Structure formats: structure tokens, C-alpha cells
Amino acid sequence: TATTLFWRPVPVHVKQQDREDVLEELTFRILTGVAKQNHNLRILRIHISSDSDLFFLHTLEVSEEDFQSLKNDEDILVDFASFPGKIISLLEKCILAQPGDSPRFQAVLTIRGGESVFKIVEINDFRRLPHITLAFRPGN
Amino acid sequence: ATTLFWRPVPVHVKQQDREDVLEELTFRILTGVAKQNHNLRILRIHISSDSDLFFLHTLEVSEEDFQSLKNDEDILVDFASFPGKIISLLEKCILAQPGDSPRFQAVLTIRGGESVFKIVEINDFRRLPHITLAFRPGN
């Protein structure tokens, strides 16, 4: 019962170990469903890819069990069912964000040794304020 | 030493045993030069309460401590501009109203010895900490 809620390009600032910053269009796909492998738990799946590099692949899978710790750490006030909607809402801001509009939202992907940390930050006069922080694994 | 800021601030004081109390705390922010430490610049923040002489919490951020804090929270300003941003955040807490959305509030979580000060933004999604600082008891 895998349902895709979102599947389109998003401008992301990519940062790697020995590469300068790069702003490029990465394809995000957000799915919600159930894994028969993991006791039929509800799951949120996010995949990051590039239309110009078929090997550039990053994936995240969050179960309802996993979300419990994630909710406490980042003080999330909504439930698991509502979580994907808020992520999409944050991505919409990054899509609509134009250079100069302060505070400006933006998506960031920091690759470290292969594995990566994804963030959507709100940039004000003082700091990059991370609205969400998620760890991705390379591949599908 | 030199005081940049010395005002009362509304703070949601949280202790273990969840004694949640919204009381006015006095905040004093000082900037100075450390004689004993080759004139290393220091930012000092003292939290106190007129109601309780034993209610004392202090933070000291040297230039070195700031470089570390700057990295963790992705701060975009230098050490000299940092106090001004804290004041702005504290002001949002002072002027905060019940019906605001998003709403800003200052939170002081006391845990045994150390405590943790935060200025969070409560929106439709989460509690978003704009700044987080570790305080220690005393002066």
C-alpha cells in the first residue's frame, strides 16, 4: 500500500568533503506505506536522486517506532500521520524561496564519507535555523 | 566589565518535579576582557531573581567558546555582534502575547547543577529553539 505523496525536483545546496558548495536540482520522492518485513509497521520513506547522475542516491526510512524518538528530540507537536505533510510544506518553501527574501528557507544535503545529513533551514540575520534534520543512507 | 543589557524577562522555569512557573527573571549581559587569560574577550550572562537570593545562574562565553557554539548552531555573526542578537531574541519573549502564532517564549530548564536556557518558537509543527545555552549555578 505504498503511496507517493510527493515526487518532483527541489533546489538543494549540496556539500561534500572535498568539494565546494553546489546548488542543484535534486529529485525528492516521499512515500508512506507498510513494510511486511518489519511487523507491518507504518513507514515514511524519502529518496533523493539526481536526473544527471544516476548513482547519486540517498534514502531514508522512518517507522512509527522510529518517529517516537525523533519526535522527542526535535520537539515535534504533530503525529506520525501528519509528519510527511509538514516535510512537504517545508520543501514547498524551499521551492518558492527566491534570493533576497529574508528569512529564506532552503534545503541542504551534507555528505560525509558517503553517508549524508539532510536539513531544511530558515536563514535569518542571526543563524541557520534547522526546522528539520534527517540522516540519509547512500543508495536506494 | 561592562553591562550591555539589564532587564527583567518572562521565563518559563522548568525543574524536575515539573514545577512550571512563569516568573520574571532578571537578566544581566556583560562583555569584558579577561585579565588572567591574556585579554581573551568574555561574554557573561547572569540570571537572577529578586524573590530568591539563592536563585543564581551564570554563563560565560569566551571567544573560543563562541567559535564552538557558532559551529553547532550555525551562527552567522561574529562574537561582537552576538550579544545584539540575544537581546533581540529576549525582546521577542518580553513582548510575546498568549494569542501569538508563532509564539516566542524563554525557557530555563534546571537539572541538578547545570541548567539549560532556550528561546523557542512554537509554530504549527514544533518547538523550534532559536538559541540554546548551558548555564551553571552561582555567580
PDB file of C-alpha atoms in Angstrom:
ATOM      1  CA  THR A   1       0.000   0.000   0.000  1.00  0.00           C
ATOM      2  CA  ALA A   2       2.890   2.321  -0.859  1.00  0.00           C
ATOM      3  CA  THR A   3       1.554   5.814  -1.573  1.00  0.00           C
ATOM      4  CA  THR A   4       3.708   8.536  -3.128  1.00  0.00           C
ATOM      5  CA  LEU A   5       2.816  11.930  -1.641  1.00  0.00           C
ATOM      6  CA  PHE A   6       5.497  13.927  -3.443  1.00  0.00           C
ATOM      7  CA  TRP A   7       7.783  13.284  -6.414  1.00  0.00           C
ATOM      8  CA  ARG A   8       9.439  16.316  -8.026  1.00  0.00           C
ATOM      9  CA  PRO A   9      12.667  18.358  -8.233  1.00  0.00           C
ATOM     10  CA  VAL A  10      13.817  20.598  -5.371  1.00  0.00           C
ATOM     11  CA  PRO A  11      16.724  23.050  -5.268  1.00  0.00           C
ATOM     12  CA  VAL A  12      19.262  21.710  -2.750  1.00  0.00           C
ATOM     13  CA  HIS A  13      22.602  23.047  -1.545  1.00  0.00           C
ATOM     14  CA  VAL A  14      24.918  20.036  -1.684  1.00  0.00           C
ATOM     15  CA  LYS A  15      28.069  19.985   0.460  1.00  0.00           C
ATOM     16  CA  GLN A  16      30.714  17.246   0.260  1.00  0.00           C
ATOM     17  CA  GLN A  17      34.090  16.581   1.883  1.00  0.00           C
ATOM     18  CA  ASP A  18      36.450  17.985  -0.766  1.00  0.00           C
ATOM     19  CA  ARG A  19      34.008  19.861  -2.993  1.00  0.00           C
ATOM     20  CA  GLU A  20      32.847  23.469  -2.834  1.00  0.00           C
ATOM     21  CA  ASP A  21      29.150  24.149  -2.218  1.00  0.00           C
ATOM     22  CA  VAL A  22      26.811  23.312  -5.099  1.00  0.00           C
ATOM     23  CA  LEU A  23      23.214  24.431  -5.596  1.00  0.00           C
ATOM     24  CA  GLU A  24      21.423  21.926  -7.834  1.00  0.00           C
ATOM     25  CA  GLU A  25      18.019  20.392  -8.559  1.00  0.00           C
ATOM     26  CA  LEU A  26      17.645  17.055  -6.766  1.00  0.00           C
ATOM     27  CA  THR A  27      14.583  14.854  -7.168  1.00  0.00           C
ATOM     28  CA  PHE A  28      12.751  14.117  -3.916  1.00  0.00           C
ATOM     29  CA  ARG A  29      10.277  11.257  -3.564  1.00  0.00           C
ATOM     30  CA  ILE A  30       8.192  10.862  -0.400  1.00  0.00           C
ATOM     31  CA  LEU A  31       6.286   7.632   0.258  1.00  0.00           C
ATOM     32  CA  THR A  32       4.058   6.341   3.043  1.00  0.00           C
ATOM     33  CA  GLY A  33       3.051   2.706   3.480  1.00  0.00           C
ATOM     34  CA  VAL A  34       3.619  -0.559   5.340  1.00  0.00           C
ATOM     35  CA  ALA A  35       6.577  -2.961   5.372  1.00  0.00           C
ATOM     36  CA  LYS A  36       5.709  -6.646   5.699  1.00  0.00           C
ATOM     37  CA  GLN A  37       9.310  -7.189   6.790  1.00  0.00           C
ATOM     38  CA  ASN A  38       9.031  -5.002   9.896  1.00  0.00           C
ATOM     39  CA  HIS A  39       5.920  -6.310  11.677  1.00  0.00           C
ATOM     40  CA  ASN A  40       3.594  -4.344   9.365  1.00  0.00           C
ATOM     41  CA  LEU A  41       4.757  -1.025  10.822  1.00  0.00           C
ATOM     42  CA  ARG A  42       3.732   2.257   9.216  1.00  0.00           C
ATOM     43  CA  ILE A  43       6.727   3.758   7.416  1.00  0.00           C
ATOM     44  CA  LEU A  44       7.830   7.057   5.900  1.00  0.00           C
ATOM     45  CA  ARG A  45      10.271   6.688   3.009  1.00  0.00           C
ATOM     46  CA  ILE A  46      12.217   9.521   1.391  1.00  0.00           C
ATOM     47  CA  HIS A  47      14.503   9.116  -1.620  1.00  0.00           C
ATOM     48  CA  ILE A  48      16.874  11.746  -3.015  1.00  0.00           C
ATOM     49  CA  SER A  49      18.222  11.414  -6.556  1.00  0.00           C
ATOM     50  CA  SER A  50      19.663  13.356  -9.493  1.00  0.00           C
ATOM     51  CA  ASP A  51      18.487  13.369 -13.105  1.00  0.00           C
ATOM     52  CA  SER A  52      22.062  13.965 -14.315  1.00  0.00           C
ATOM     53  CA  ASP A  53      23.773  11.386 -12.070  1.00  0.00           C
ATOM     54  CA  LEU A  54      22.064   8.011 -11.702  1.00  0.00           C
ATOM     55  CA  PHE A  55      24.488   6.959  -8.955  1.00  0.00           C
ATOM     56  CA  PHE A  56      23.734   9.959  -6.744  1.00  0.00           C
ATOM     57  CA  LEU A  57      21.205   8.219  -4.495  1.00  0.00           C
ATOM     58  CA  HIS A  58      20.213   8.754  -0.858  1.00  0.00           C
ATOM     59  CA  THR A  59      17.407   7.098   1.105  1.00  0.00           C
ATOM     60  CA  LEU A  60      15.717   7.450   4.493  1.00  0.00           C
ATOM     61  CA  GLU A  61      13.169   5.162   6.134  1.00  0.00           C
ATOM     62  CA  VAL A  62      11.339   6.225   9.301  1.00  0.00           C
ATOM     63  CA  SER A  63       8.961   3.830  11.051  1.00  0.00           C
ATOM     64  CA  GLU A  64       6.298   4.870  13.556  1.00  0.00           C
ATOM     65  CA  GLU A  65       8.539   3.322  16.212  1.00  0.00           C
ATOM     66  CA  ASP A  66      11.492   5.401  14.995  1.00  0.00           C
ATOM     67  CA  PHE A  67       9.369   8.558  14.908  1.00  0.00           C
ATOM     68  CA  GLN A  68       8.831   8.390  18.670  1.00  0.00           C
ATOM     69  CA  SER A  69      12.456   9.254  19.441  1.00  0.00           C
ATOM     70  CA  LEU A  70      12.585  11.713  16.542  1.00  0.00           C
ATOM     71  CA  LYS A  71       9.521  13.465  17.954  1.00  0.00           C
ATOM     72  CA  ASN A  72      11.099  13.914  21.386  1.00  0.00           C
ATOM     73  CA  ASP A  73      14.499  15.053  20.112  1.00  0.00           C
ATOM     74  CA  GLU A  74      13.124  17.785  17.845  1.00  0.00           C
ATOM     75  CA  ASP A  75      10.021  18.543  19.931  1.00  0.00           C
ATOM     76  CA  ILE A  76       7.576  17.695  17.138  1.00  0.00           C
ATOM     77  CA  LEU A  77       3.991  18.559  18.099  1.00  0.00           C
ATOM     78  CA  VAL A  78       2.161  16.644  15.351  1.00  0.00           C
ATOM     79  CA  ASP A  79       1.598  12.894  14.980  1.00  0.00           C
ATOM     80  CA  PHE A  80       3.285  10.442  12.605  1.00  0.00           C
ATOM     81  CA  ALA A  81       0.484  10.621  10.033  1.00  0.00           C
ATOM     82  CA  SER A  82       0.891  14.404   9.830  1.00  0.00           C
ATOM     83  CA  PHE A  83       4.700  14.358   9.702  1.00  0.00           C
ATOM     84  CA  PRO A  84       5.089  13.839   5.919  1.00  0.00           C
ATOM     85  CA  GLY A  85       2.768  16.779   5.272  1.00  0.00           C
ATOM     86  CA  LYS A  86       4.953  19.111   7.326  1.00  0.00           C
ATOM     87  CA  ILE A  87       8.071  17.950   5.481  1.00  0.00           C
ATOM     88  CA  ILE A  88       6.380  18.614   2.135  1.00  0.00           C
ATOM     89  CA  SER A  89       5.258  22.008   3.427  1.00  0.00           C
ATOM     90  CA  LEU A  90       8.869  22.824   4.303  1.00  0.00           C
ATOM     91  CA  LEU A  91      10.021  21.666   0.866  1.00  0.00           C
ATOM     92  CA  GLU A  92       7.438  23.928  -0.782  1.00  0.00           C
ATOM     93  CA  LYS A  93       9.078  26.889   0.954  1.00  0.00           C
ATOM     94  CA  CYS A  94      12.487  25.909  -0.442  1.00  0.00           C
ATOM     95  CA  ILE A  95      10.943  25.676  -3.911  1.00  0.00           C
ATOM     96  CA  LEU A  96       9.266  29.088  -3.675  1.00  0.00           C
ATOM     97  CA  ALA A  97      12.193  30.748  -1.874  1.00  0.00           C
ATOM     98  CA  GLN A  98      13.811  33.463  -4.001  1.00  0.00           C
ATOM     99  CA  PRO A  99      17.227  35.036  -3.298  1.00  0.00           C
ATOM    100  CA  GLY A 100      16.730  38.135  -1.140  1.00  0.00           C
ATOM    101  CA  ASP A 101      13.563  37.163   0.725  1.00  0.00           C
ATOM    102  CA  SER A 102      14.653  37.262   4.372  1.00  0.00           C
ATOM    103  CA  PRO A 103      14.194  34.938   6.165  1.00  0.00           C
ATOM    104  CA  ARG A 104      14.855  32.471   3.329  1.00  0.00           C
ATOM    105  CA  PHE A 105      14.150  28.737   3.543  1.00  0.00           C
ATOM    106  CA  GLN A 106      16.475  26.259   1.839  1.00  0.00           C
ATOM    107  CA  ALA A 107      17.234  22.548   1.592  1.00  0.00           C
ATOM    108  CA  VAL A 108      20.752  21.373   2.452  1.00  0.00           C
ATOM    109  CA  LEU A 109      22.436  17.999   1.951  1.00  0.00           C
ATOM    110  CA  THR A 110      25.797  17.447   3.646  1.00  0.00           C
ATOM    111  CA  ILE A 111      27.566  14.265   2.537  1.00  0.00           C
ATOM    112  CA  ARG A 112      30.183  12.881   4.942  1.00  0.00           C
ATOM    113  CA  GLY A 113      32.252   9.860   3.922  1.00  0.00           C
ATOM    114  CA  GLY A 114      29.352   8.736   1.738  1.00  0.00           C
ATOM    115  CA  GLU A 115      26.508   8.992   4.238  1.00  0.00           C
ATOM    116  CA  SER A 116      24.607  12.282   4.428  1.00  0.00           C
ATOM    117  CA  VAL A 117      22.622  14.618   6.672  1.00  0.00           C
ATOM    118  CA  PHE A 118      19.690  16.484   5.125  1.00  0.00           C
ATOM    119  CA  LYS A 119      18.322  19.747   6.521  1.00  0.00           C
ATOM    120  CA  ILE A 120      15.763  22.435   5.770  1.00  0.00           C
ATOM    121  CA  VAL A 121      16.987  25.620   7.436  1.00  0.00           C
ATOM    122  CA  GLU A 122      15.462  29.058   7.924  1.00  0.00           C
ATOM    123  CA  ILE A 123      18.176  31.665   7.401  1.00  0.00           C
ATOM    124  CA  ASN A 124      17.623  34.879   9.362  1.00  0.00           C
ATOM    125  CA  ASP A 125      20.008  37.686  10.341  1.00  0.00           C
ATOM    126  CA  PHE A 126      21.403  35.609  13.220  1.00  0.00           C
ATOM    127  CA  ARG A 127      21.640  31.926  12.222  1.00  0.00           C
ATOM    128  CA  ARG A 128      20.667  28.987  10.039  1.00  0.00           C
ATOM    129  CA  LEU A 129      17.660  27.661  11.954  1.00  0.00           C
ATOM    130  CA  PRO A 130      17.108  23.956  11.177  1.00  0.00           C
ATOM    131  CA  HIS A 131      13.380  23.194  11.003  1.00  0.00           C
ATOM    132  CA  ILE A 132      14.172  19.538  10.300  1.00  0.00           C
ATOM    133  CA  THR A 133      17.287  17.354  10.366  1.00  0.00           C
ATOM    134  CA  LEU A 134      17.364  13.858   8.873  1.00  0.00           C
ATOM    135  CA  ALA A 135      20.111  11.297   8.289  1.00  0.00           C
ATOM    136  CA  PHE A 136      20.141   9.567   4.896  1.00  0.00           C
ATOM    137  CA  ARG A 137      21.874   6.399   3.708  1.00  0.00           C
ATOM    138  CA  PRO A 138      23.503   6.102   0.269  1.00  0.00           C
ATOM    139  CA  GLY A 139      21.746   4.092  -2.444  1.00  0.00           C
ATOM    140  CA  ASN A 140      18.118   3.033  -2.797  1.00  0.00           C
TER     141      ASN A 140
ATOM    142  CA  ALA B   1      33.462  44.624  32.643  1.00  0.00           C
ATOM    143  CA  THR B   2      30.535  46.474  31.059  1.00  0.00           C
ATOM    144  CA  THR B   3      26.787  45.803  31.129  1.00  0.00           C
ATOM    145  CA  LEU B   4      25.033  45.887  27.750  1.00  0.00           C
ATOM    146  CA  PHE B   5      21.663  44.621  28.964  1.00  0.00           C
ATOM    147  CA  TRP B   6      19.985  44.564  32.370  1.00  0.00           C
ATOM    148  CA  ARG B   7      16.224  43.959  32.215  1.00  0.00           C
ATOM    149  CA  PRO B   8      13.564  41.630  33.639  1.00  0.00           C
ATOM    150  CA  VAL B   9      12.459  38.823  31.298  1.00  0.00           C
ATOM    151  CA  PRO B  10       9.458  36.465  31.418  1.00  0.00           C
ATOM    152  CA  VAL B  11      10.792  32.906  31.691  1.00  0.00           C
ATOM    153  CA  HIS B  12       9.112  29.512  31.875  1.00  0.00           C
ATOM    154  CA  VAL B  13      11.236  27.999  34.635  1.00  0.00           C
ATOM    155  CA  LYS B  14      11.170  24.202  34.409  1.00  0.00           C
ATOM    156  CA  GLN B  15      12.558  21.940  37.124  1.00  0.00           C
ATOM    157  CA  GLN B  16      12.430  18.194  37.609  1.00  0.00           C
ATOM    158  CA  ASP B  17       9.169  17.795  39.544  1.00  0.00           C
ATOM    159  CA  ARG B  18       7.791  19.893  36.704  1.00  0.00           C
ATOM    160  CA  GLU B  19       7.273  22.957  38.912  1.00  0.00           C
ATOM    161  CA  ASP B  20       6.421  25.032  35.826  1.00  0.00           C
ATOM    162  CA  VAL B  21       6.325  28.683  36.859  1.00  0.00           C
ATOM    163  CA  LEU B  22       6.123  31.711  34.577  1.00  0.00           C
ATOM    164  CA  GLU B  23       8.045  34.303  36.589  1.00  0.00           C
ATOM    165  CA  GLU B  24      10.019  37.445  35.782  1.00  0.00           C
ATOM    166  CA  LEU B  25      13.760  36.824  35.995  1.00  0.00           C
ATOM    167  CA  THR B  26      16.463  39.486  35.878  1.00  0.00           C
ATOM    168  CA  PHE B  27      18.917  39.088  33.000  1.00  0.00           C
ATOM    169  CA  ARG B  28      22.277  40.854  33.040  1.00  0.00           C
ATOM    170  CA  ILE B  29      24.516  40.643  29.972  1.00  0.00           C
ATOM    171  CA  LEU B  30      28.099  41.860  30.337  1.00  0.00           C
ATOM    172  CA  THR B  31      31.025  41.959  27.928  1.00  0.00           C
ATOM    173  CA  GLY B  32      34.614  42.242  29.131  1.00  0.00           C
ATOM    174  CA  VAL B  33      38.303  41.417  28.832  1.00  0.00           C
ATOM    175  CA  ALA B  34      39.799  38.551  30.857  1.00  0.00           C
ATOM    176  CA  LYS B  35      42.942  39.796  32.633  1.00  0.00           C
ATOM    177  CA  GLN B  36      44.027  36.358  33.849  1.00  0.00           C
ATOM    178  CA  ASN B  37      43.599  34.989  30.309  1.00  0.00           C
ATOM    179  CA  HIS B  38      45.675  37.251  28.016  1.00  0.00           C
ATOM    180  CA  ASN B  39      42.767  39.657  27.433  1.00  0.00           C
ATOM    181  CA  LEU B  40      40.505  36.997  25.950  1.00  0.00           C
ATOM    182  CA  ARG B  41      37.103  38.630  25.354  1.00  0.00           C
ATOM    183  CA  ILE B  42      34.300  37.249  27.530  1.00  0.00           C
ATOM    184  CA  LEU B  43      30.518  37.425  27.223  1.00  0.00           C
ATOM    185  CA  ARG B  44      28.819  36.942  30.594  1.00  0.00           C
ATOM    186  CA  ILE B  45      25.100  36.367  31.156  1.00  0.00           C
ATOM    187  CA  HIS B  46      23.752  36.342  34.718  1.00  0.00           C
ATOM    188  CA  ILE B  47      20.234  35.195  35.582  1.00  0.00           C
ATOM    189  CA  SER B  48      18.830  36.106  38.991  1.00  0.00           C
ATOM    190  CA  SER B  49      15.596  36.573  40.934  1.00  0.00           C
ATOM    191  CA  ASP B  50      14.684  39.398  43.313  1.00  0.00           C
ATOM    192  CA  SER B  51      12.441  36.904  45.102  1.00  0.00           C
ATOM    193  CA  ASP B  52      15.238  34.421  45.842  1.00  0.00           C
ATOM    194  CA  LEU B  53      18.853  35.341  46.620  1.00  0.00           C
ATOM    195  CA  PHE B  54      19.867  31.711  46.032  1.00  0.00           C
ATOM    196  CA  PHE B  55      18.384  31.647  42.532  1.00  0.00           C
ATOM    197  CA  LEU B  56      21.592  32.272  40.597  1.00  0.00           C
ATOM    198  CA  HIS B  57      22.640  31.103  37.137  1.00  0.00           C
ATOM    199  CA  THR B  58      25.597  32.282  35.079  1.00  0.00           C
ATOM    200  CA  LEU B  59      27.018  31.708  31.609  1.00  0.00           C
ATOM    201  CA  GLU B  60      30.408  32.795  30.307  1.00  0.00           C
ATOM    202  CA  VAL B  61      31.206  32.561  26.607  1.00  0.00           C
ATOM    203  CA  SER B  62      34.779  33.425  25.677  1.00  0.00           C
ATOM    204  CA  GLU B  63      35.756  33.991  22.048  1.00  0.00           C
ATOM    205  CA  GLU B  64      36.904  30.368  21.948  1.00  0.00           C
ATOM    206  CA  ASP B  65      33.647  29.056  23.425  1.00  0.00           C
ATOM    207  CA  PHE B  66      31.848  31.118  20.790  1.00  0.00           C
ATOM    208  CA  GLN B  67      33.728  29.518  17.885  1.00  0.00           C
ATOM    209  CA  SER B  68      32.409  26.198  19.175  1.00  0.00           C
ATOM    210  CA  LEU B  69      28.859  27.456  19.728  1.00  0.00           C
ATOM    211  CA  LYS B  70      28.952  29.161  16.326  1.00  0.00           C
ATOM    212  CA  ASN B  71      29.624  25.817  14.638  1.00  0.00           C
ATOM    213  CA  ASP B  72      26.945  23.823  16.473  1.00  0.00           C
ATOM    214  CA  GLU B  73      24.072  26.259  15.881  1.00  0.00           C
ATOM    215  CA  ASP B  74      25.281  27.707  12.553  1.00  0.00           C
ATOM    216  CA  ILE B  75      25.535  31.278  13.850  1.00  0.00           C
ATOM    217  CA  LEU B  76      26.211  33.776  11.051  1.00  0.00           C
ATOM    218  CA  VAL B  77      27.603  36.696  13.062  1.00  0.00           C
ATOM    219  CA  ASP B  78      30.918  37.299  14.819  1.00  0.00           C
ATOM    220  CA  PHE B  79      31.438  37.387  18.588  1.00  0.00           C
ATOM    221  CA  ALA B  80      30.966  41.171  18.746  1.00  0.00           C
ATOM    222  CA  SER B  81      27.525  41.084  17.098  1.00  0.00           C
ATOM    223  CA  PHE B  82      26.344  38.060  19.083  1.00  0.00           C
ATOM    224  CA  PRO B  83      25.045  39.959  22.158  1.00  0.00           C
ATOM    225  CA  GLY B  84      22.783  42.101  19.970  1.00  0.00           C
ATOM    226  CA  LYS B  85      21.065  39.008  18.596  1.00  0.00           C
ATOM    227  CA  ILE B  86      20.478  37.570  22.068  1.00  0.00           C
ATOM    228  CA  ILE B  87      18.868  40.857  23.107  1.00  0.00           C
ATOM    229  CA  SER B  88      16.553  40.777  20.092  1.00  0.00           C
ATOM    230  CA  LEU B  89      15.502  37.236  20.992  1.00  0.00           C
ATOM    231  CA  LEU B  90      14.924  38.188  24.628  1.00  0.00           C
ATOM    232  CA  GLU B  91      12.800  41.114  23.437  1.00  0.00           C
ATOM    233  CA  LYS B  92      10.541  38.779  21.466  1.00  0.00           C
ATOM    234  CA  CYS B  93       9.962  36.875  24.708  1.00  0.00           C
ATOM    235  CA  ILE B  94       9.185  40.077  26.610  1.00  0.00           C
ATOM    236  CA  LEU B  95       6.667  41.259  24.010  1.00  0.00           C
ATOM    237  CA  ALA B  96       5.172  37.790  23.465  1.00  0.00           C
ATOM    238  CA  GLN B  97       1.395  37.503  23.880  1.00  0.00           C
ATOM    239  CA  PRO B  98      -0.819  34.446  24.543  1.00  0.00           C
ATOM    240  CA  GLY B  99      -2.544  34.532  21.148  1.00  0.00           C
ATOM    241  CA  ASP B 100       0.622  34.913  19.071  1.00  0.00           C
ATOM    242  CA  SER B 101       1.305  32.422  16.279  1.00  0.00           C
ATOM    243  CA  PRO B 102       4.148  31.591  16.152  1.00  0.00           C
ATOM    244  CA  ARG B 103       4.783  32.439  19.818  1.00  0.00           C
ATOM    245  CA  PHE B 104       8.183  33.091  21.398  1.00  0.00           C
ATOM    246  CA  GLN B 105       8.958  32.118  24.987  1.00  0.00           C
ATOM    247  CA  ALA B 106      12.080  31.888  27.140  1.00  0.00           C
ATOM    248  CA  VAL B 107      12.625  28.571  28.912  1.00  0.00           C
ATOM    249  CA  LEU B 108      15.044  27.731  31.716  1.00  0.00           C
ATOM    250  CA  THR B 109      15.352  24.002  32.397  1.00  0.00           C
ATOM    251  CA  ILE B 110      17.134  23.377  35.703  1.00  0.00           C
ATOM    252  CA  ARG B 111      18.711  19.937  36.160  1.00  0.00           C
ATOM    253  CA  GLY B 112      20.515  19.433  39.469  1.00  0.00           C
ATOM    254  CA  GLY B 113      23.610  21.565  38.987  1.00  0.00           C
ATOM    255  CA  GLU B 114      23.683  22.704  35.364  1.00  0.00           C
ATOM    256  CA  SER B 115      20.699  24.333  33.665  1.00  0.00           C
ATOM    257  CA  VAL B 116      19.744  24.999  30.040  1.00  0.00           C
ATOM    258  CA  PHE B 117      18.349  28.276  28.714  1.00  0.00           C
ATOM    259  CA  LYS B 118      16.356  28.320  25.482  1.00  0.00           C
ATOM    260  CA  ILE B 119      14.337  30.732  23.378  1.00  0.00           C
ATOM    261  CA  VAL B 120      11.887  28.615  21.394  1.00  0.00           C
ATOM    262  CA  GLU B 121       9.424  29.400  18.610  1.00  0.00           C
ATOM    263  CA  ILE B 122       6.190  27.418  18.888  1.00  0.00           C
ATOM    264  CA  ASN B 123       4.606  27.031  15.446  1.00  0.00           C
ATOM    265  CA  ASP B 124       2.044  24.670  13.888  1.00  0.00           C
ATOM    266  CA  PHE B 125       4.666  21.925  13.644  1.00  0.00           C
ATOM    267  CA  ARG B 126       7.178  22.008  16.513  1.00  0.00           C
ATOM    268  CA  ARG B 127       9.015  23.860  19.259  1.00  0.00           C
ATOM    269  CA  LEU B 128      11.895  25.491  17.391  1.00  0.00           C
ATOM    270  CA  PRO B 129      14.838  26.630  19.560  1.00  0.00           C
ATOM    271  CA  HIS B 130      16.370  29.815  18.133  1.00  0.00           C
ATOM    272  CA  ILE B 131      19.158  29.640  20.718  1.00  0.00           C
ATOM    273  CA  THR B 132      20.292  27.162  23.369  1.00  0.00           C
ATOM    274  CA  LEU B 133      22.751  27.949  26.165  1.00  0.00           C
ATOM    275  CA  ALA B 134      24.109  25.923  29.084  1.00  0.00           C
ATOM    276  CA  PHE B 135      24.077  27.822  32.384  1.00  0.00           C
ATOM    277  CA  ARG B 136      25.832  26.878  35.620  1.00  0.00           C
ATOM    278  CA  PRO B 137      24.646  27.735  39.151  1.00  0.00           C
ATOM    279  CA  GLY B 138      26.035  30.683  41.112  1.00  0.00           C
ATOM    280  CA  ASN B 139      27.806  33.861  40.013  1.00  0.00           C
TER     281      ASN B 139
END
